[PDB]
Design an enzyme around this catalytic site. Structure first.
Site, PDB file in Angstrom:
ATOM      1  CG  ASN A   1       0.111  -6.323   6.804  1.00  0.00           C
ATOM      2  OD1 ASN A   1      -0.675  -5.442   6.452  1.00  0.00           O
ATOM      3  ND2 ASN A   1       0.954  -6.087   7.806  1.00  0.00           N
TER       4      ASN A   1
ATOM      5  CB  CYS B   1      -4.705  -1.048   5.656  1.00  0.00           C
ATOM      6  SG  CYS B   1      -5.738  -0.051   6.808  1.00  0.00           S
TER       7      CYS B   1
ATOM      8  CD  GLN C   1      -1.337  -0.114   3.655  1.00  0.00           C
ATOM      9  OE1 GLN C   1      -1.843  -1.166   4.043  1.00  0.00           O
ATOM     10  NE2 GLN C   1      -1.587   1.072   4.293  1.00  0.00           N
TER      11      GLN C   1
ATOM     12  CG  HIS D   1      -3.272  -2.525   9.677  1.00  0.00           C
ATOM     13  ND1 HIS D   1      -3.094  -1.713   8.578  1.00  0.00           N
ATOM     14  CD2 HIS D   1      -2.614  -3.674   9.419  1.00  0.00           C
ATOM     15  CE1 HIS D   1      -2.345  -2.354   7.691  1.00  0.00           C
ATOM     16  NE2 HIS D   1      -2.040  -3.540   8.177  1.00  0.00           N
TER      17      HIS D   1
END
Ligand code: CA
Length: 215
Positions: free
Chosen positions: A182, A25, A19, A162
């Site tokens: 992630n 996110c 990102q 997040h």
């Protein structure tokens, strides 16, 4: 539900993305849950566009943050989301440039897991596919995670900040975990993933703001 599941094995998860300096996110978590369903419904694995969401989910705040349920509502109302190739990631907020010609997936709404229910989260990942999850990722131990099953007592279930994606769960060396993807690039964690403790009092608030899209 099975004792363990790993969607990476089934070909349901696209490669880890990065990102950059944008607080996007939430868009990456949302496209990952959509790509999981798109693979289950069409048999094809392809990147969806995080940029489409960043510039188009007016309910969200671009690089300023947002929520996955808001992203799934936009895709549903918009009658689609473009593939990453049709709408490339640039890492900064721009005017909405959605093009129906590049449409690669649809959504008919969404569902949220019961709050704090790690059992229901498990049943969903197993029954539906990868699920978008929110966690408190503010700890230095999380940022520097490298291997094993992550657990830090200081993590705060009430400080969600997040968005990531649960692509499975299992156990490693006797420690139950959630397999998390992630969007900090392949170099972060273990090939861009982190195994987070499962059934340890909803560590980092992983089952507090979980959702998946209907497709
Ligand atoms: Ca909303």
């Amino acid at each position: 539900a099975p004792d363990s599941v790993d969607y990476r094995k089934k070909g349901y998860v696209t490669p880890v993305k990065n990102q950059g300096q944008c607080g996007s996110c939430w868009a990456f978590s949302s496209v990952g849950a959509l790509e999981g369903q798109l693979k289950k419904k069409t048999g094809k694995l392809l990147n969806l566009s995080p940029q489409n969401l960043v510039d188009c989910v007016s309910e969200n705040d671009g690089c300023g943050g947002g929520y996955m349920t808001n992203a799934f509502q936009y895709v549903q109302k918009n009658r689609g989301i473009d593939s990453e190739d049709a709408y490339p990631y640039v890492g900064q907020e721009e005017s909405c440039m959605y093009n129906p010609t590049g449409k690669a997936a649809k959504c008919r709404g969404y569902r949220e897991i019961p709050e704090g229910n790690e059992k229901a989260l498990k049943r969903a990942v197993a029954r539906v596919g990868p699920v978008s999850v929110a966690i408190d990722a503010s700890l230095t131990s999380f940022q520097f995670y490298s291997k094993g099953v992550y657990y830090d007592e200081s993590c705060n279930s009430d400080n969600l900040n997040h968005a990531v994606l649960a692509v499975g769960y299992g156990i490693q060396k006797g420690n139950k975990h959630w397999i998390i993807k992630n969007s900090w690039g392949e170099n972060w964690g273990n090939k861009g993933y982190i195994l987070m403790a499962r059934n340890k009092n909803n560590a980092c608030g992983i089952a507090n703001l979980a959702s998946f899209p209907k497709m």
